[model samples]
Target: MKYLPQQDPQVFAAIEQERKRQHAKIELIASENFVSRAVMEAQGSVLTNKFAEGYPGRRYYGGCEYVDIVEELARERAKQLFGAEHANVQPHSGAQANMAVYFTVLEHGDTVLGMNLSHGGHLTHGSPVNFSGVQYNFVAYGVDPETHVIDYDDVREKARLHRPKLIVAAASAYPRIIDFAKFREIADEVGAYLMVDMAHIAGLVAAGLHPNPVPYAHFVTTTTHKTLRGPRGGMILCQEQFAKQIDKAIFPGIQGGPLMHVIAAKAVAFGEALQDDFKAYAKRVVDNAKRLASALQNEGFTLVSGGTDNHLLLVDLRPQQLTGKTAEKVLDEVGITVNKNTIPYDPESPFVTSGIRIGTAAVTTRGFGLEEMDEIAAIIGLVLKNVGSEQALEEARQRVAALTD
Candidate 1:
């Protein structure tokens, strides 16, 4: 920060503004979190200068001993945290992590089953615009329209219908605890490999608050950030049998150099997650989500799953006769940030959906709890219910400013 501030005042000014912005706005984005100082320090370390291309001690580049140590710590810590037989902490992002997994197991045009994007799955899961959907014949299984929960029977039906070679689990915006056991069962019966993208819930899994998919899935992919509170990067965990393939798929197949500094940061983040307090933090995150969900419901907003067993929830804005696009804009205008999202069987297009996704992890990290959750829900209700009222908007803005301070 010292050299950057002195060397490039323009970029430094933007970064400073972002820092102030983070403090001012209430972030409810599910895919974001604030990493600890130690994590930030590790990410900003001298290790960033290295280019260690292969696994630890077997790098394609020379003078990699120090980088190797950093990477091994990340790999071992990831395995320890996830209870996995093998771990690859080199994926630059969640998208690359997923692409590598597909490269390892799938051939072009192979049928793969994943949750429908509109029903809570991620873009990497199988959006037509993504590489996964382009390279593979991706089919979808949707949640129940009424309950907004993934039904095992429906999944089984789809598994039989498509007979996919792989069945992807977990989601980007799902609020309920996914049944990894049932997903494994379906994959077993269909002779398919099970891969769970636990990107959003990696920290919960690390805390043992959510069901760990490492045991059931052939491969598990996740971002080290989000609820993990790590640096922005991705990790993949698999059984010992697929370890080398997964590594090679990432190295020669997809990417060249690894981010040694980020791996160092990821290791530090994993060390923090291994502590007893992370469990308590994760528990509070979910508790806050449930509180916020109920409070919103009381304010006449319908929750996608009625409530949450995790850190995030999707609010169906249909009852208010408002679009998710409008709601997101108004919330941001009021200094509260949330994303427009699609609920199950949403009538609106992806751009103007019926719901907005919100998470408590970042706020919980900022020391918010059940009480603040209620306060936040109230501000949201005030802003959305009186979208046209400048008085209500002004009041919500003031309330948001007070809470942030």
Candidate 2:
């Protein structure tokens, strides 16, 4: 018999309250997005019970007949979406995907170059606390001190000096377009492999709003959920030459059975991304982010890198008489969801960052537009203007409630 939680009123009530919270709030977290009901249904399907350890036909367990088709569909759609020669959708998450790639190509003590964690890079990109740094020789590069953008020349300089085996080109907070072609050239000059983590901008890139990295990077990694609007999972794509090794690395090497349910959800999301309307939706994401950035700047907020080229931007909140941490807490209390983020060259600690990162993907998915962003920005400003005042936050919370109602 299937298990049911209907006997528990408290648990069911809590789930309903959480659902209501989502329906009532504005989510601005840069790394968040909303999946369609179809995707959610796929996530809860019978595929979850399948134990497909290896790729389609070559599984460690039997009865993989149905799952094979689902995995194949996910693979085909992912390759088509990113224009990659091969795609592996078995990774558990972005960090796991990166781990597989690194283990497949490089060894302990091998030098690898990536963006500094404090300057818009992910933890897997060589944070001292992560396995990438402790197991391998990590050389980090950062954004230009003034422009708050990646300085390719500096990356080249670092690559030339370190002669790393791999060069990782990606970011989490820097608000500018990355030149993947230039990164490829530099990596070629240094005889290093280039990997692009498009987790933050996969939807935009897939929609042609941003440059594709397939022609430049040897490998790419992304989380299926962030901008891809799927369930929380990861995928790795590679040139055909590295296909076999990539697959092995993710399977027996890093993980065992794949989350077949998530693969099904990924298939659903990929199908959605393939539609013509997705492009328009992706463009609106950019427009909403631009509008939010402009609104924040007009209120005298310092936007790192000045503005955004995609769906997210980092705001320097020091001038607003509040730490990013405090601002995030206050905003959360008011039902506006955003994240405290460290700005490029920020002197503050990560916990008490000088900046907050916001995005438009989730809000846009909820059907909000530029006008809504303007009012939201004004609400944020009012809260900041009256820093540490609960009265102001309570009033803003009421205003936010009115938006959803």
Candidate 3:
């Protein structure tokens, strides 16, 4: 709005359009949220010019004394939020956070057990295409076919069969509470390390709405964004004993320098999460999600796990004889946004899946409540059920405009 409009008009104009777009449309993507203006301001500050290579006190570069204070705030606040013995607030993204954890403990060929991608696992968990799967032998445990809940029996069976070095818990699209204690028990029974990638539910965990993985798992990784409502970055929480190895793995092992600006933003967001209002916000997130899910179900959509206990849900479009691809496009036409995702044991390909993933974080951040969620689901239902009707699509758009305005 200031110098960017004059010096970088082209880029600034593009950014302006994106800013308008976000306000004009709805954001339902499970992994997205609107960060606070303060967080954005901190990320855009002059701290970006710094090159702090190592942890807080001991840095690899000069002039890091001030940056050291920022990094310490992030690390300490993160530790306090999760009740973890140690925190590494420098990984560039959630994938990098998981990568650092992997680099710290596992050899190249060590076996790991994670959830199946189609059943709510992240690509970074083990997609065969990612470094986690390519470098380590990844055995997946999936959810129950009918109940759509994680099959702990399958996890125990896999651990006993494969003798994996690590057992991963948590998911990207799962809408229920994860049993980290059960996961830890399985890991202990098999002499394996436990890591939880709570990227999508970090805010809930921070608010104590969801069970904390810090006590049950050896390592926990999460993005500062997503439900955490921070900048687009990552953090890792681990035991104090493994602090040295984890820090080294992130610094010289994977990355050369840290993003001081993003770290500062992370600090601001963590500070916000430590407040009482954040818990209220997180509770509303889940409440909105449940309302949205119920509305969709009433509109004849089959939801994964029947409904959600968290801020996201997976709608299986199969009963409607539709594809997620078409639903996503049609909803976009009506100014709504969501991503196509695969339900458990989906017969369709990943690119052309049978489900869509939606979340309540952004809308909740914008102060949209249960009633707004109902209207959103109704719009989605109308658009998807009448993809052939321009009149209905336009009606949906007008309704969306009303809500957003």
Candidate 4:
């Protein structure tokens, strides 16, 4: 930062503004989190200059002895944390991690079944706009209309009808626990492989707050950020038999040199997750989500699944006759950040959906508990109820300032 201010004032100013913005805002985005200084320092270390093109003990470049140590610690910690037989820590993002898995086991145009994007699935989960859908035949399965939860029967029916070679079991905006055992059963019946994109709930899983997909899935993928609270990166965990294929697919098949610094940050985050305090933090995240959900319900907001079992809630805004777009804008204006999302069987388009997704992971990281969650919920209710009023927005902004301060 010392050199940055003199060398490039413009970029430095933007970075400073962003730092202030993060400090002053309430981050409710489900896929975002604040990493610790330890993780940040590791990510900003001199290791960024190194080019460790291969795994530990098999590097394509020299001076990788220390880089190898960092990578191996990351790999070993990930395996220990997830109870997996093998792990590949090289993929640059969650999308790339999934792509590597697809490349490892699936042929071009092979049939795959995944959760529908509008029903809470990530874009990498076979969305037509992404490479997974473009390269493979993707058939979507969605949640039950009335319950607003994953309908295992519907998934089973889709699996039987499509006979997909790979079945993906994960979601981005879902508020319920994923039943990986059922997904494994469906995959077994159809002779398919089960891959879980656990990007959203990786930390919860690591803390034993959510069911671990490693035992039931042939391959599992996660982002190092989000609930993981690590530097931005991706990782893949699989059985021993598929380790070599996954590694090769990520290396020669997809990306070239890996980012050693981010991998080191991931290792640090994994180490933190292994501690007892992380378990308590994970529990607090869920507790805050539940309190927020209840508070929103009390304020007359309708939740997608009526409640949450994890760290996020999808609020259906139709009851209040508000579009997700408008809600998102109004909330941001009040310094309460959230994203518009598409609910199950959404009647509106993706860009103008009838839902907003909120989570407590980042706020919980900032030491927010249930009482603060209630305050947040009340603030959101205030903004949405007075969406077009300047006075109400100003008042809400003041309240947000008090909380953030």
Candidate 5:
């Protein structure tokens, strides 16, 4: 009846292989990051043994005194890290944090406005397949067709017409800097509560590389990983007025016992982010992104939004006569990792997208810089140039190995 080795050797072996692959490949996925050892340690700590149903001191279970301190430390660190008046470090993922924000503020079928999914918005923003759409009146605004940037004029028009109860501003793939103040103005004109889902730019915002949205938005939600480099978790930050409602929504309303271990790791990551060097780290992330984007653009690849103002960029492969699927596969063959993405108003399907979303957070965390980005761009260019040629791809793969080694 030995369950692990006897029943799951293949599964265990797959886990080992994935770890090896992670070590070998250069990860460039836009929403991915390499968490520090301290964060991982906290993720695997003894806190996982406890079940705390409620926040800190007000728990349903006994023997939560230690975790109370842990959770409080996480909340305090998050508040300081992002300069929020109140923070809830509970939601299981970015999507959940967003759901909690909506649940706390509005009723089912209430009107809300957000970015359009195909134009750099998230599925949770209001996709028809998602709860945000079917249960609520979900209106969306998109980027300028010519410029491929958030069209505030369009957003303002949508706000005026929709009169949504809430206005959500954020993106999963857009490369430009988000103007929270602009979004706030549109929200105010419609008398809607403004919420900034700073999930993508949380670290930059915290490090002052990007403008912080906390001061402008009534509420904010972000993932603890991605640019924040924490465990896979989410946090909700808001003004003091909505603190209690947000917490309750995350607790009895949506989810049950919080993931304490992940919260502990989030605390660790937030603590690390508070240190002085984190600012430099965040700045380097953007620099690396710019370097990569410029290099690729110079190689004749079209970059969505021209180039990035943040950690990630979407590369249109059409100019190179490559499909996103082929580009992703070619890069993987060369020991590089990136996700196939749909460019705004993509002609291809999502499964075989026309673009690739690449980011600098993981590679920059691994100590790659401008020089390395140039080399990576060259490798990518060569791979695309030799797309469908297995022999050339293998040679390029060897070159990638030599470079990484």
Candidate 6:
């Protein structure tokens, strides 16, 4: 940053501002986390200058010897972390990891069964506007209306009816634990390929806090960040049989050259996840999520699933007649960041949804425990309940500043 400030003060100033913001704000975004300094170092390394076009020992470009080592380390560490037979740490993001899986198994216009986006599924999970939906036929299954949890029977019914070529079992905002074994049964009954996007819960799965999909799904894809606390990248794990197909699909099939620097960072993050402390950290993340959910409920906020069993909670704001957009804005103003999310059977449009999604992964990584989570929930409740009051907002901001300080 010394050289950066000397060379380009504007960009350097922005970077410094972002650093200050990250330290100042309380991040509740379910999809975001703070990476370790080691991970950041690897991501910012000189490896970024290299261009590794293929897998180890099979590159299309030169000067790949050291980059090859980095990729292999990433692949091996990922395999060890997830207990997968094969690992491809290449695709640029979770969406691309999913696309590669689709390309590997399904044909154009193939039928696929996935969770509904409005019901907690991701954009890549067959949203009509996404490439996944346009390139293939996608049918959706969703959570039970009353219980706000996945209805395994409904999933089975949909799989039977669609007889899809692939059935995806994952979510972006789900609070309950996914039964990968049950998904396997439905996929098996329909003779469909099972692909689990463990992007959000990768760290929990690695720490055995949640069920691992590696033994159940034909393909498992994940982003290295999120709960994994890694660099912002993606990885795929599958059986050894589908290894080559998955590799080919990610390389020439979709992405071009691999990001060697990010791969090195992934390797570093995976190594960190393998440590005993990470397991403790993962457990704390879930514990904090649960405590925060309870505190919010006590503040008269309705949780989507009645509660959470993982790192995130979907707060339904309909009870308070609060729009998710307003909640997000008010919280952001108070230095508590969260995202507007669509709840099951949401009454409003996606842009003005009825819910906010919150997670404990980021705060827990910053060493926040139950007490801090409870305080955070109180702050959120106070801000949302007094949105029009500048005095209340200032009070909330002071509380946040106290915590950050």
Q: Given candidate 4, what's the lDDT at residue 315?
A: 97
Give the Cα-based TM-score of candidate 1 against the true structure: 0.99
Instruction: Give one digit per residue, the lDDT tens place, for model 2 in 10-73.
Output: 7777877888888988899988888999999899898988889999889888999899999999
For candidate 2, the clash count comes to 0
For model 4, the local distance difference test gives 0.93
Q: Over the stretch 1-405, how does candidate 3's per-residue lDDT look in tens digits?
A: 589999998999899999999999999999889999999999999998988888777987888999999999999999999999999999999999999999999999999999999999999988889999999999999999998999999999999999999999989989888999999999999999999999999999999889999999899999999999999989999998989999999999999899999999999999999999999999999999999999999888899999998999999999888888988888989899999999999999999999999999999999999899889989998888898999999999999999999
lDDT of 6: 0.94
Q: Candidate 4 clashing pairs? A: none
- Count of backbone clashes for each model? 0, 0, 0, 0, 0, 0
Residues 1-405 of candidate 5: C-alpha lDDT, one tens digit per residue: 145557899987887788777777888998988888889888878888889999888999999999999899999999888889999999999999999999988999999999988888889899899988987899999898767899999999999998999999988898999988999999989899998998889999889988899999999999999998889988999989999999999999999998888988999999999998888999999999999999998888899989999999999888887789988987887788999998888889888989999999988888888998998888888788878788878887887786667
Model 2: weakest 10-residue lDDT segment is 1-10
| Pairs with backbone N, CA or C atoms under 3 Å apart (clashes), candidate 2 | none
**TM-score of predicted structure 5:** 0.96
Best by lDDT: 6
**Model 4, residue 170: displacement in angstroms?**
0.3
Off by over 4 Å in 1: none
Local distance difference test, candidate 5: 0.89
Which residue segments of model 5 deviate by more than 4 Å? Answer: 1-12
lDDT of 6 at 166: 96
Off by over 4 Å in 3: none
Off by over 4 Å in 4: none
Each prediction's TM-score versus the true structure: 0.99, 0.97, 0.99, 0.99, 0.96, 0.98
